[PDB]
């Protein structure tokens, strides 16, 4: 709703080819306005503001015009505020207003209403529209229709549409409380000027092409439709769309409709808009943008059940043909959200095939990592059962798509977070096990001498969260094999080794507990194997106090299963390498342990 | 030594009419207790008929009065005020002229306050003005027009005018000076898209009598109502505001007359010149 948001949008989108020096000049004129007004030179302020608004009547640098509009209108609103608070200083009700301030503001109005040019008059009058409150209870209402009609004198449709944009902006900012509506109709009455020959030869003389000229309208038209349609009734919107249908090359018009109109309203007209976009022409505004806006609206609204599939079909029947991958993905990322939302794993698998096909050639994915990231985030979000998510035959190749290191590790962290936060029971499914093993391998492989400690901590948390979600039921030999394989996989990362050592010891104790002692010969061999594993692993840990503590716990766990000394010898031999309190407690624990050895 | 003297008018807008009385106050701020010999005020009303670049071109006076506001005395330090008034009336049936600013008929009504001093100071003079409105006197007279090359009588070298069929109409040429000039203009056809459309208020003044005079025409204000190639069939609007008192109701006097007209001047891409010179019977109603 606020203009500042759209101000930033237009500024960020229309930085075009100095332009920085030109904006510096605009702000210098604003500063001169402020200083001159501060020195009680009112006429200098008014004249400089006329000088500024005169720059919006010219369109020499056609591409940059919307940002010129934003900046010069900012100075124009500065003038409005200055004069308004000055008259308020001289001075509630318009009748209650003293006659002196009334005289000053009438002088202001007669000063502005004697300018030679139409566009400066319109700008410097709509700027101070607020001041009309003092003259009468109905100054704004009686002055606004005249302002809308005055635009008819502007032929160049770009300037006309942006003047309507500013007028709607001031009407919303000053007297938001129907009259503004006519603006749009008048635009329609002059819409034909957009493709009318005069504008075309103007363009061809300046050195611009229609597909680039038209994209200068979307901001102004979007603001116009947002202002008029705001809380508009269904009948008014129906009439607007009805007029937008017959109006020749309504491509850009439909784009503005889908950008401004509520997605609730655009979704239920999905079939109509699909047909209209089909009827449009590809020479001017590309159809991919229109289908992108339709997808955006669908993301917020669900069309009727009777044709949703068909919509999808038509969408991907055209979206698939898009021959510029950069153009393709920018319209497919929005559609894939609906694909996942409204259709089963087969449809999402097919669209995944399509997107891999489109982005793979010439490594075009290299440039569109952000959108691939967003689509994969959405894909993961839509799926809760990871078994299904890995049943999709084109999940792993998509992951392989991210050949870059940083992005791939980021995606691995994301999927691991999804797993840990949406998995409350350990899994034996070979598919899940394999997929998670692959992703964790590629995630770990990132660490290196330049890796940061907190990065190591977060990755360790991820891999430990995984390894904590792998269980083999009663089977303990296979469970020990899994742990030893995980050790082989996660050698470099140390906390994973710590967790795996704790886990092998806990498994040995569980094997003890699931038989109430008298470990059978097979289990005797198994327990000897696990304790040998723990012995082999411990020396690898880099820490010192942790190494000693784990040696002690390994001694306890080995003593627990009648496997009788080497661990304590190793710990004692390590002692000389070793903070005083930690060592004291370690030796106290060692002495207590030996009390039963 | 010097101090501050000023003249203040009771009405903010200074608007006054025949039969009314002008009131005000003379206010002086003084850094010292200044002894003086007198401060006087003079109200005058005149019309400074210039001569075209004679028999009956002398300036004439409508009303005149003067009052020695202050006798010899002394003005203390601080703020001091002395009211003053004047009657706005004329002998017999004569009526006051409108406060008109022009170039060959300039009607004004002024107050002059003069202060007199002595050793340690000097005499000073101050001027002022107030607005006098002519009395109220309506039937609109819309003037449909068709700006075409064949209808421009002044255009005898028409070979250079490409075909066009501008239509439209002024809502009235008998314009209430407190209401705007309103009309429509439609470009029904233009081989050469319009380069611009303007509304030029020309004042014509005559300063003399039947024996001999010079009529002089000047332009009060030019405003532009359409720029660039407007859409064909679209009703461009003609909204004009009349100057507060830079314009006066047209006057018929044995010595001088003031009259007005509006020219619709259209410019075409080949810098062509259209000129439709409508009449203007301005009045105060």
């Amino acid at each position: 709703e606020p203009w500042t948001n759209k101000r930033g949008e237009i500024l960020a989108r229309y930085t075009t080819t100095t332009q920085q020096d030109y904006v510096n000049r605009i702000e210098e004129l604003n500063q001169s306005l402020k200083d001159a007004w501060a020195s009680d030179q009112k006429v200098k302020a008014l004249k400089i503001v006329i000088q500024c608004s005169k720059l919006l009547s010219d369109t020499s640098v056609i591409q940059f015009y919307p940002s010129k509009f934003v900046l010069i209108t900012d100075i124009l609103d500065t003038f409005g505020k200055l004069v308004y608070e000055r008259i308020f200083s001289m001075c509630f009700s318009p009748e209650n207003a003293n006659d002196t301030a009334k005289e000053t503001c009438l002088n202001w109005f007669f000063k502005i209403a004697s300018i030679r040019e139409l566009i400066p008059r319109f700008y410097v009058e709509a700027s101070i529209l607020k001041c009309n409150k003092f003259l009468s209870k109905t100054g704004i209402s009686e002055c606004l229709p005249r302002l809308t009609c005055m635009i008819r004198g502007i032929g160049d449709p770009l300037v006309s549409v942006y003047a309507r944009a500013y007028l709607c902006r001031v009407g919303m900012e000053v007297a938001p409380h129907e009259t503004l509506n006519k603006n749009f109709f008048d635009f329609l009455l002059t819409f034909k000027q957009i493709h009318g020959d005069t504008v075309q030869n103007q363009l061809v003389v300046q050195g611009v092409e229609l597909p680039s000229y038209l994209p200068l309208y979307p901001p102004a038209m979007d603001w116009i439709f947002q202002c008029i349609s705001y809380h508009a009734p269904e009948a008014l919107l129906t009439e607007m769309m009805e007029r937008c249908k017959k109006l020749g090359n309504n491509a850009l018009l439909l784009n503005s409709v889908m950008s401004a109109f509520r997605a609730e309203f655009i979704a239920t007209r999905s079939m109509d808009f699909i047909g209209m976009i089909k009827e449009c022409d590809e020479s001017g505004f590309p159809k991919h943008l229109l289908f992108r806006s339709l997808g955006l609206n669908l993301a917020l609204a669900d069309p009727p059940e009777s044709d949703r599939l068909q919509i999808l079909n038509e969408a991907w029947k055209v979206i698939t043909k898009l021959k510029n991958p950069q153009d393709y993905i920018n319209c497919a990322e929005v559609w894939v959200e609906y694909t996942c939302k409204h259709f089963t794993k087969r449809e999402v698998n097919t669209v995944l095939a399509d997107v891999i096909k489109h982005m793979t050639p010439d490594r075009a994915f290299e440039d569109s990592y952000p959108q691939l990231q967003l689509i994969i985030k959405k894909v993961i979000a839509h799926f809760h059962d990871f078994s299904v998510l890995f049943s999709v035959e084109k999940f792993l190749p998509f992951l392989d798509m991210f050949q870059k290191e940083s992005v791939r590790v980021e995606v691995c962290k994301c999927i691991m977070d999804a797993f840990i936060k949406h998995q409350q029971e350990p899994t034996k499914d070979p598919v899940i096990l394999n997929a998670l093993l692959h992703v964790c391998k590629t995630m770990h492989d990132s660490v290196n001498a330049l890796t940061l400690e907190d990065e190591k901590r977060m990755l360790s948390y991820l891999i430990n969260g995984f390894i904590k979600m792998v269980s083999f039921g009663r089977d303990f030999e296979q469970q020990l094999s899994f742990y030893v394989e995980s050790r082989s996989m996660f050698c470099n990362l140390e906390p994973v080794l710590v967790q795996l050592i704790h886990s092998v010891n806990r498994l040995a104790m569980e094997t003890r507990k699931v038989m109430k002692g008298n470990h059978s010969r097979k289990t005797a061999a198994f327990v000897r194997a696990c304790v040998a594993y723990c012995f082999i692993t411990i020396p690898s840990l880099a820490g010192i106090f942790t190494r000693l503590n784990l040696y002690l716990h390994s001694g306890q766990v080995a003593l627990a299963n009648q496997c009788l000394d080497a661990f304590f010898k190793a710990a004692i031999s390590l002692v000389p390498e070793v903070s005083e309190s930690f060592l004291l407690e370690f030796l106290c624990n060692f002495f207590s342990t030996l009390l039963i050895v | 030594m010097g101090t501050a003297l000023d003249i203040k008018i009771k009405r903010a807008n200074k608007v006054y009419h025949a039969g009314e009385v002008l009131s005000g106050v003379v206010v002086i701020s003084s850094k010292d207790s200044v002894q003086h010999q007198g401060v006087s005020l003079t109200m005058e009303g005149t019309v400074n008929l210039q001569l075209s670049a004679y028999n009956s071109v002398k300036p004439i006076q409508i009303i005149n009065s003067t009052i020695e506001m202050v006798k010899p005395g002394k003005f203390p330090s601080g703020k001091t005020e002395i009211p003053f008034e004047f009657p706005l009336h004329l002998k017999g049936n004569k009526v006051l002229y409108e406060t008109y600013h022009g170039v060959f008929v300039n009607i004004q009504y002024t107050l002059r306050c003069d202060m007199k001093r002595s050793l340690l100071a000097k005499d000073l003079t101050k001027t002022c003005e107030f607005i006098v409105h002519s009395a109220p006197q309506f039937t609109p007279s819309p003037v449909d027009f068709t700006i075409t090359p064949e209808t421009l009588q002044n255009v005898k070298e028409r070979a250079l005018l490409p075909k066009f069929l501008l239509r439209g109409h002024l809502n009235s040429t008998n314009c209430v000076i407190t209401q705007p000039l309103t009309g429509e203009l439609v470009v029904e056809s233009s081989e050469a898209a319009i380069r611009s459309v303007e509304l030029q208020l020309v004042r014509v003044e005559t300063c003399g009598c039947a024996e001999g005079y010079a009529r002089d025409a000047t332009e009060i204000q030019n405003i532009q109502i359409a720029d660039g190639d407007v859409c064909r069939g679209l009703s461009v609007p003609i909204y004009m505001v009349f100057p507060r008192l830079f314009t006066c109701p047209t006057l018929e006097t044995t010595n001088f007359k003031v009259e007005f007209e509006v020219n619709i001047v259209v410019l075409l891409h080949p810098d062509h010149l259209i000129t439709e010179n409508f009449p203007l019977k301005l009045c105060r109603i």
């Binding site: 006429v43 000053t104 002088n107 202001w108 007669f110 000063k111 300018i115 | 009060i220 204000q221």
Partner: peptide, 13 residues
């Protein structure tokens, strides 16, 4: 030659 826009003074505003 004298407009209604070059004859409004700062004082009057």
């Amino acid at each position: 030659g004298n407009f209604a826009f070059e004859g409004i003074g700062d004082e009057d505003l």
